[PDB]
Amino acid sequence: MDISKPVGSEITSVDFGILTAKEIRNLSAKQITNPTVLDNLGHPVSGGLYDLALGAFLRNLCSTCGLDEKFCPGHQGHIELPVPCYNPLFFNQLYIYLRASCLFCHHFRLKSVEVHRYACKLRLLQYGLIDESYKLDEITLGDISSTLLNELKSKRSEYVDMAIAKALSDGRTTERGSFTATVNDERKKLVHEFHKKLLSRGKCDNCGMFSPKFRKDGFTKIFETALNEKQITNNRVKGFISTYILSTEVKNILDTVFRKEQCVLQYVFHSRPNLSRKLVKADSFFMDVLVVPPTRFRLPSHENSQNQLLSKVLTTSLLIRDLNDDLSKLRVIFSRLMNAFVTIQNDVNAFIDSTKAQGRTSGKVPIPGVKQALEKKEGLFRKHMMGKRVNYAARSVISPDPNIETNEIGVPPVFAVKLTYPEPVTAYNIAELRQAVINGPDKWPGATQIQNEDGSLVSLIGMSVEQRKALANQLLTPSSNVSTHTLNKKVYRHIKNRDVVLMNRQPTLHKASMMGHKVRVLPNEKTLRLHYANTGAYNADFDGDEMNMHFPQNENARAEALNLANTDSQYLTPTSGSPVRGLIQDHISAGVWLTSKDSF
Amino acid sequence: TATTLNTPVVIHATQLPQHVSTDEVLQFLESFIDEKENTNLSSSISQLKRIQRDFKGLP
Amino acid sequence: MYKTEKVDLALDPITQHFGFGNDEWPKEWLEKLDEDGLPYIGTYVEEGDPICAYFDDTLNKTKIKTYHSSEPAYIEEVNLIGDESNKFQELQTVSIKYRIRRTPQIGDKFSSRHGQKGVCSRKWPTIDMPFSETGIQPDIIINPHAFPSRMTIGMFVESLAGKAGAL
Amino acid sequence: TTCQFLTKAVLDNEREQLDSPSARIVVGKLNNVGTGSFDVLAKVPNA
Amino acid sequence: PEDFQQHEQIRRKTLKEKAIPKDQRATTPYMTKYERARILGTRALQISMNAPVFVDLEGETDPLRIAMKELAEKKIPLVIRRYLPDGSFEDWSVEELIVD
Amino acid sequence: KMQYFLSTGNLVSQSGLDLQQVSGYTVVAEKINFYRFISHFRMVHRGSFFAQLKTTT
Amino acid sequence: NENRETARFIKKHKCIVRVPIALYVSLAPMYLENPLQGVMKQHLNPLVMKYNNKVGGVVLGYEGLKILDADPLDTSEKLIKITPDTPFGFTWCHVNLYVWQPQVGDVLEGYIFIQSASHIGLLIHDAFNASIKKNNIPVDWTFVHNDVELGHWVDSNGEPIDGKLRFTVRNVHTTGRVVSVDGTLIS
Amino acid sequence: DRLLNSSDYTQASVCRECGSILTTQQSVPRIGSISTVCCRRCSMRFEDAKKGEKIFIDDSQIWEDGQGNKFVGGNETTTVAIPFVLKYLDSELSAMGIRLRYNVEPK
Amino acid sequence: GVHVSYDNSIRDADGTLVQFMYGGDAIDITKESHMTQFEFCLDNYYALLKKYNPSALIEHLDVESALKYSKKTLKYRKKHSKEPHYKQSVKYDPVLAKYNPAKYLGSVSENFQDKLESFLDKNSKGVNEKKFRALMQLKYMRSLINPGEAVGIIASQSVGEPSTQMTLNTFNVTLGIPRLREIVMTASAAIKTPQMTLPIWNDVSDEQADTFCKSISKVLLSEVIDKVIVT
DNA sequence: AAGTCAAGTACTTACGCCTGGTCATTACTAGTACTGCC
DNA sequence: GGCAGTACTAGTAGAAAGTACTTGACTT
RNA sequence: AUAAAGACCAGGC
Ligand SMILES: [Zn+2]
Ligand SMILES: [Zn+2]
Ligand SMILES: [Zn+2]
């Protein structure tokens, strides 16, 4: 990071969302259909997974942005599906709601008073109000006529409106609603009770008839169960007053079901007051158009990417778009269409997850496409989110070195040439930094790179001494124009005894295992130094122990490492009050003799 | 050029445009031309002089 | 040390041949390579030095396969290998063997045959080293404080038998 | 178990303010604990 | 020209509501080591950009120690913005804070 | 094919023969010291599968 | 369904006149004790006579240099907020700008500067640039070229045109180097 | 400043009204016009956006992709310091169907 | 995320509270070493007064405000001294709760004063007393935890650092990291070793306790059968 | 007929870091172009 | 000159535990 | 002028 480029914004909060149809209809740039990687002669094919409009690829300019590989951050893609299907992440949630709604009235199998009760209770739970959530449950004053039920919903509405009115009126809850842990406890509990719902119930309470239940066939094809004798008679009295069915009809059911109960799911699927007033339907989770990442995340090096899975989805997609074209100019043609639906939904489910594909003989592990690729050893995040590959750091074997005052270390010249640190040229460095730029990277102490005012980075790897002096006499100079006059060059400086370096050793297990020390060059060897009382805090030895060596890249980082994470301030460990420091064997075995009486 | 150091991050016109006549424009130009020369600003001041002469006289 | 490298040329008419051609090419890299396309036996080859140069016909240029490693090495022998066939086949596989002078520095895990693994802190001069009554200076000094913990009495009794055997 | 947590996070439309340090390392500004709680202001003599 | 005007008045009103007056602050009056590590870090990084100096500098080159001398003589135009978990904040001037 | 067996080490067998593991059968003899010479010739291994099991018996 | 999605889309986004503006810029450390001059020499001086997207026109100066204070209190000793990563100080402030914004349909005066065979380059009030393409030339008007050394235009009456030439704005060009105002011929 | 400002530190471009990073891009400008950048998600095709008389834009809103298609809208964006692997999260998680929107400050 | 705030209270990241004060005193372990060395600090009173400099810690500090409340609390404590809190009034909270810790002098903890006045009662010693206890209470007022210290990380590392030292099998009941991890991670439920400690009565004796253990000790039907001959 | 209690089971889970080495670029199989004998 | 064997190429195919969530039997 | 990943074995703390 350079302190010459300030960031003009930050991120206070983040919120989630679900891609819908029209969002990705206007999001991507081009539609790709054929399952080809690239044709011969080595150039990107049009309409392929490596389409040139999805970012630069193999030193070829992009077709969307028009820049090279370094300046093109990629572009989002999409593939078209013939029929919409669900996602493997939400299928466990849709199974509960598909086994819930009535197939005739398109409502839930409960009655309206209790469903509205849970809806208006979650209406209170959206805000930080909990004192009245249970007072509303005891409001039952007054088989059952619909008049007193509608009036009951009226008094509940006035009760909730009055509750939110007085809570928002006097300092209790903000207009955006409060969010804590105790409110999420009862929300995740009441919604979990909302999933302990009708699943153990029978006939619908709104309309007096049962409904055929669904049976999940464990990963691909929730099925529909056949009816029995004591219920077909119910099909004959409702007029008095196990089978693969289809895929899109599930959406046909969930559409009307999520329309006749919009106010309920409005509060169930929202953990905050809906200020935008949007409608939640079945088109959100039901994916109709896939999304492929840009080619920058799809480099070939072999099919070392999701290509061998997206090409399978596009292959079945091309086979099935020739099916309805075969039936246009109008049996096994129906069985292969049913199997096409099953093999294309299992295909996209194989792309997202790796626990639902039919597979084949032992594959030495299937390729991790997206999710199992996002979890290499159960949460890949531990590779690029928690622990990073830090820059400007050294690592070598340590060796004992007395005469160092318990706060410095010894750094080899080989480490005093590679590592560096930026320092802006000022009026208090014209006498010392000029010696560095004249010296150069190899001979200590010098400068390896000079950062211009225009961002361009110059180095001194293969430049001569006359060129070093040329940049020296032209080092402390005003900028080229006014827009760049605010700063000057930031000449890099390898290391000096006024710099700070933090020592670390795996496995670090306590606060004192990473201390900030001063440095001191020692042109003697290529290994690191340490003090006797210092190796006792790191729980280290000298039988070949290898530990790391970090290096800050900010002046404020030097302050924290020299005044807060310093070694002398870490004399006492915050565990039991015992100082983890002190000479170990040699300087104590000489104390019994030096401070003795038989020593004149 | 085209950086947060040179260009503002967020800009918003505070109040609706209230019209000013030629007298206010003439007083404005004559005020902050004497109050600007108290490197690239000279090329801009030379363009303020043109609108200051035309709305006052003939070139 | 001894680090053997196996170079295979021409990544079916062969186009990459060991050696040079006929057109213009820069000089100053003839100290290691010969006119036959093989390096001299004994030259000093550090990181970024020519080991084998090849002449391509599709580009009509002699490109040099560089040598990038950790430590500089000395060439000791270069093997030539050509697959046997009824027809004549030009060599396309060369086996070269290096050697690295590993001077014993500090930090090497010097030890004995008793299990006391240690490293070297600093190599002291002989004149700053304690000298015996005869005048010898023990080239190695091990810490006497590791014995109450390592419990390695073998390096004491064997040290008696060692001196008693050398006398 | 970030997959199952992603399900229950987007299903309820979660809007987190990235206050926990594990969330202040994904993007973050500095941190919440330590020297990341307070901020720095600077007085200027002229208006 | 009307929407962000109310938004601006909301920003100023909420900020003034979070701002606690001068005589009501009831926090510790001693310079914390975190604010000390940040006043030495921010000022050293501040003076590194050729800032106007308020103390005598003789042959010194380490900006970190320069900030230590600035804090030793209390010649820095900087005020600590101590936040509260509820959202309020105090403005504690470094000149008023005592050090050890 | 048997060259691949001794090269990579893992056996691609149809019959699924007796031993439980599937890899870890060949060892690259570095031939660094005569003690490493004799060590590989008097070698005993319980099995690379027990390296994953976390018992202490 | 459609009307609800338009509600989702509408909430997705949720001749010299003076206008007050509120901006949010940085501040250099060398201008610590003199912040107003720093802001002027960093975001105000390179802004005048440069087209701005927000106001939609050419800036012709500034007025009302009031730096917004971070602590709502009567002293001139204000305070600026420094970011935790750079010594620069991000501060709000309001300022009035006299902007020149020619809109489409307005009638404006011009001064002849270029008389070509298919285009007229003119300087409106000697400061800005304007153009009139060949498709905006009346059929009655005829161009005559000079063989001695440039050319001239002939109106419907049959005489050359005068220097003072008034027309109507067609379109304002922004992405170019200098603001160019296109002209119409028939309304 | 070590786990972020050493390797992952990249100043990407974040949209304001949409709040995503991957969707914004830089259109192909003219020979005179340079430095164009916008968010193409909130934008719409020019021919589809038409019109209380007929409204006209300053032709600076208009931007065009390399394919030649004409667009209008989606301009509010800024530069924000962000780890690049978080942009990888925005891309990889978008392949699952999940959307991450970030609201920058101000607003 | 849990840490000390400026209100002198440890709380999580979002803002929810954990405890109103760090260990009741908000003092760091790295500084509570000489807090109980009354004879040591008394022997070196001059140097401590030289480095603490109490003569410069009176401007922004209140002295008598906390001393009055501490005098009243110490008065009622020794006034009853008979029954635990199940019949004790709460009208006098600790002298640190209602007062500012790092602003009001004399506002100290309870056991610290109980051993302070006891140490003073067991000696008579040439430095005076009103200045010795002033430097002592000032020492307690300059040993608090700095507001902002990362507390939960220290609590996480100080409880696992010695766990590496003593990860073994035994050294009567399960012990070590198999139990230390079980209490925290396994969502403690019906456990492998249900323990319960019972304080015995005074008038009862050995022949009164063995009848109790024989009474509760379960006996299955198998403990009585010696031989089964099923024919 | 519905609510509760008990059983199956799906998978979800488990040290810190680093240096080397090989290794393999898929194997079985069938359509087709080229060479030599009759 | 026509038939057929042979080799080269492109395409395709048995072992650790700990807990809550779902579901079938049971009894009122 | 260039150089990326996962699979198995051995080894250091
Ligand atoms: Zn592109
Ligand atoms: Zn029904
Ligand atoms: Zn957008």
From Swiss-Prot, chain C:
Q: Which domain of life is it from?
A: Eukaryota
From the Swiss-Prot or TrEMBL record, state where the protein is found: Nucleus, Nucleolus
Quaternary structure and interacting proteins, as annotated: Component of the RNA polymerase I (Pol I) complex consisting of 14 subunits: RPA135, RPA190, RPC40, RPA14, RPB5, RPO26, RPA43, RPB8, RPA12, RPB10, RPC19, RPC10, RPA49 and RPA34. The complex is composed of a horseshoe-shaped core containing ten subunits (RPA135, RPA190, RPB5, RPO26, RPB8, RPB10, RPC10, RPA12, RPC19 and RPC40) where RPA135 and RPA190 form the DNA-binding cleft. Outside of the core, RPA14 and RPA43 form the stalk that mediates interactions with transcription initiation factors and newly synthesized RNA.
Which family, according to UniProt? Answer: Belongs to the RNA polymerase beta chain family.
Quote the function comment for this protein.
Answer: DNA-dependent RNA polymerases catalyze the transcription of DNA into RNA using the four ribonucleoside triphosphates as substrates. Component of RNA polymerase I (Pol I) which synthesizes ribosomal RNA precursors. Besides, RNA polymerase I has intrinsic RNA cleavage activity. RPA190 and RPA135 both contribute to the polymerase catalytic activity and together form the Pol I active center. In addition, subunit RPA12 contributes a catalytic zinc ribbon that is required for RNA cleavage by Pol I.
Q: What is this protein called?
A: DNA-directed RNA polymerase I subunit RPA135
Report the source organism: Saccharomyces cerevisiae (strain ATCC 204508 / S288c)
From Swiss-Prot, chain E:
State the remark under miscellaneous. Answer: Present with 6090 molecules/cell in log phase SD medium.
- State the compartments where it is located: Cytoplasm; Nucleus
Q: What is its main location?
A: cytoplasm
Q: What does this protein do?
A: DNA-dependent RNA polymerases catalyze the transcription of DNA into RNA using the four ribonucleoside triphosphates as substrates. Common component of RNA polymerases I, II and III which synthesize ribosomal RNA precursors, mRNA precursors and many functional non-coding RNAs, and small RNAs, such as 5S rRNA and tRNAs, respectively. Pol II is the central component of the basal RNA polymerase II transcription machinery. RNA polymerases are composed of mobile elements that move relative to each other.
Q: Does the keyword Cytoplasm apply?
A: yes
Give the protein name, as stated in the record. Answer: DNA-directed RNA polymerases I, II, and III subunit RPABC2
The species this protein was found in: Saccharomyces cerevisiae (strain ATCC 204508 / S288c)
* Stretch of the intact protein here: 55 to 154 of 155
Q: Region (Leucine-zipper) spans which residues?
A: 57-78
Q: Which GO terms describe its cellular component?
A: cytoplasm; nucleoplasm; nucleus; RNA polymerase I complex; RNA polymerase II, core complex; RNA polymerase III complex
Single GO term (MF): DNA binding
Keywords, alphabetical = Cytoplasm, DNA-directed RNA polymerase, Nucleus, Phosphoprotein, Ribosome biogenesis, Transcription
* Disulfide topology: none
Curated annotation (Swiss-Prot), chain G:
Q: What is its main location?
A: nucleus
Q: Give this protein's Gene Ontology molecular function annotations.
A: DNA-directed RNA polymerase activity
- GO terms, biological process: nucleolar large rRNA transcription by RNA polymerase I; ribosome biogenesis; termination of RNA polymerase I transcription; transcription by RNA polymerase I; transcription elongation by RNA polymerase I; transcription initiation at RNA polymerase I promoter
Q: According to its record, what are the GO cellular component terms?
A: nucleus; RNA polymerase I complex
Where found, per UniProt? Nucleus, Nucleolus
PTM text: Contains an average of four phosphates per molecule.
Q: Keywords in alphabetical order, please.
A: DNA-directed RNA polymerase, Nucleus, Phosphoprotein, Ribosome biogenesis, Transcription
Anything further noted?
A: Present with 4070 molecules/cell in log phase SD medium.
What function does the entry list? DNA-dependent RNA polymerases catalyze the transcription of DNA into RNA using the four ribonucleoside triphosphates as substrates. Component of RNA polymerase I (Pol I) which synthesizes ribosomal RNA precursors. Besides, RNA polymerase I has intrinsic RNA cleavage activity. Through its association with RRN3 is involved in recruitment of Pol I to rDNA promoters. In vitro, the A13-A43 subcomplex binds single-stranded RNA.
**Family indicated by similarity:** Belongs to the eukaryotic RPA43 RNA polymerase subunit family.
Q: What is this protein called?
A: DNA-directed RNA polymerase I subunit RPA43
Organism taxonomic ancestry: Eukaryota, Fungi, Dikarya, Ascomycota, Saccharomycotina
State which stretch of the full-length protein is shown. Answer: 8 to 251 of 326
Swiss-Prot record, chain I:
Other remarks on this protein = Present with 2840 molecules/cell in log phase SD medium.
Protein name, entry field: DNA-directed RNA polymerase I subunit RPA190
Family membership noted in the UniProt record: Belongs to the RNA polymerase beta' chain family.
* Subunit note: Component of the RNA polymerase I (Pol I) complex consisting of 14 subunits: RPA135, RPA190, RPC40, RPA14, RPB5, RPO26, RPA43, RPB8, RPA12, RPB10, RPC19, RPC10, RPA49 and RPA34. The complex is composed of a horseshoe-shaped core containing ten subunits (RPA135, RPA190, RPB5, RPO26, RPB8, RPB10, RPC10, RPA12, RPC19 and RPC40) where RPA135 and RPA190 form the DNA-binding cleft. Outside of the core, RPA14 and RPA43 form the stalk that mediates interactions with transcription initiation factors and newly synthesized RNA.
Disulfide bridge map: none
Its source organism is: Saccharomyces cerevisiae (strain ATCC 204508 / S288c)
What is the role of this chain?
DNA-dependent RNA polymerases catalyze the transcription of DNA into RNA using the four ribonucleoside triphosphates as substrates. Component of RNA polymerase I (Pol I) which synthesizes ribosomal RNA precursors. Besides, RNA polymerase I has intrinsic RNA cleavage activity. RPA190 and RPA135 both contribute to the polymerase catalytic activity and together form the Pol I active center. In addition, subunit RPA12 contributes a catalytic zinc ribbon that is required for RNA cleavage by Pol I.
Q: Where in the cell is it found?
A: Nucleus, Nucleolus
